[PDB]
């Protein structure tokens, strides 16, 4: 119950609605423009009716000496529009505002920066923010779910991202801040018509949360029986996905021309000459689809078939049953029965820390406890008549079997995969 101490507002999904489960009974009014789902996610758009109003229980008591409280929530911010970089970088918009008599707090966003602002009764202001890079090949934050926690005490305001301290601002100068006014969740500013934000698990505490307490809540809220996709949403059966490899982030799978194997190519990247932004393309390579062996949620330990689309037909990923080396090239072919190929894969999650990566274990039989190997990427010698050249191939490897047991789990292992479905928050026009 550690992560339930001092909680004074806990918004949770219930019957197609959002309700305060803090135990203090705050009134919550979600207007028709807010999209909600049973995974506790809610979307704020640019529509005028896309808003939530929370009226706090006025009997709640706050620290009278100094501002001693914390706010936490998960958020997913869409990628910038390539042809709208300037507005992205410059236009700041409020997403959550709690003001009373011109005093209070607010959470706002300017491009790739998330901002926390406090205004005391004298009108004095202070802010602290977290900005993520927008020039990396692959970002851990753009359009992906991440955990935010802001804490305030007598001396400073801190921002923790995914359980870790990222920013701090001294606020010893700030005097009384009125924090019990109405909370308005709504995009406010000069925003594009297509702008939107997803949020989840919004909570407020009347105390400064410790780093230990914050890291703990991160893990508890990251926990689920099901696997997640690249953006952090639940992984699904019967859904098209591109594949990403954590150990070779700039690599993607492509069916080799005239050969039933998967070769690994290099991800292309942003063309247009904008020194402000850089990224590698995500929607490339073969389109895969996970099928249940037996639209659902793919859970750890499930037995599946990893299929993909090859010219108007659904194909499948197989492993030869008798390769004699440590690792071998996977066989990518039509769906059919065979004596010499395994097609059953058990999807796993070996990491004990929050992750969006999963592993693919080929099984002889669902029943047999025998382990054939894990799917990964390996460099194969393609020695040609002239001289020997090498090339990476989509493979099965027995070497990962032992490595995945080492603790702490190695996040960079080549057997770590992520699934990327097309998402409205990530657009990559040529």
């Amino acid at each position: 119950s550690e992560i339930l101490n001092n909680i004074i507002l806990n918004l949770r999904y219930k019957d197609n609605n959002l309700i305060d489960l803090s135990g203090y009974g705050a009134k919550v009014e979600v207007y028709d423009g807010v999209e909600l789902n049973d995974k506790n996610q809610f979307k704020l758009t640019s529509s005028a009716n896309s808003k939530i109003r929370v009226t706090q229980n006025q009997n709640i008591i706050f620290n009278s000496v100094f501002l001693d409280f914390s706010v936490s929530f998960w958020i997913r911010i869409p990628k910038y529009k390539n042809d709208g970089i300037q507005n992205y970088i410059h236009n700041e918009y409020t997403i959550i505002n709690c003001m009373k008599n011109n005093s209070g707090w607010k959470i706002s966003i300017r491009g790739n920066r998330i901002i926390w602002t406090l205004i005391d009764i004298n009108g004095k202001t202070k802010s602290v923010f977290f900005e993520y890079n927008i020039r990396e090949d692959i970002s851990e934050y753009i359009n992906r779910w991440f955990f935010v926690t802001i804490t305030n005490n007598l001396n400073n305001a801190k921002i923790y991202i995914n359980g870790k301290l990222e920013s701090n601002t001294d606020i010893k100068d700030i005097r009384e801040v009125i924090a019990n006014g109405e909370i308005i969740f709504k995009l406010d500013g000069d925003i594009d018509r297509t702008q939107f934000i997803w949020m989840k698990y919004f909570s407020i505490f009347n105390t400064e949360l410790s780093q230990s307490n914050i890291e703990e809540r991160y893990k508890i809220q990251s926990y689920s029986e099901y696997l997640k996709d690249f953006w952090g949403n639940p992984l699904m059966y019967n859904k098209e996905y591109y594949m990403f490899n954590a150990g070779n982030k700039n690599s993607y799978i492509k069916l080799k021309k005239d050969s039933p194997v998967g070769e690994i190519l290099t991800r292309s990247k942003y063309n247009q000459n904008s020194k402000y932004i850089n990224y590698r393309d995500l929607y490339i390579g073969e389109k895969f689809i996970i099928r249940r062996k037996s639209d659902d949620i793919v859970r750890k330990e499930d037995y599946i078939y990893l299929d993909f689309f090859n010219l108007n037909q659904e194909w499948r990923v197989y492993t030869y049953k008798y390769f004699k080396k440590e690792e071998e090239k996977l066989f990518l072919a039509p769906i059919s029965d065979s004596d010499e190929f395994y097609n059953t894969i058990q999807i796993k999650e070996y990491d004990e820390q929050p992750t969006y990566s999963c592993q693919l274990l080929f099984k002889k039989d669902e029943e047999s406890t025998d382990e054939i190997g894990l799917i990964g990427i390996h460099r194969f010698y393609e020695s040609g008549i002239v001289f020997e050249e090498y090339k990476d191939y989509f493979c099965i490897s027995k070497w990962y079997l032992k490595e995945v047991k080492r603790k702490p789990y190695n996040l960079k292992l080549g057997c770590n995969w992520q699934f990327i479905p097309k998402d409205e928050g990530w657009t990559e026009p040529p």
């Binding site: 050969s259 090239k329 066989f331 072919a333 039509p334 190929f341």
Partner: peptide, 17 residues
């Protein structure tokens, strides 16, 4: 029918040599 068999052969050559 199943040319799955022909492919199986292109596979074996791809790994063999």
């Amino acid at each position: 029918e199943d040319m799955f068999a022909k492919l199986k052969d292109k596979f074996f050559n791809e790994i063999n040599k």
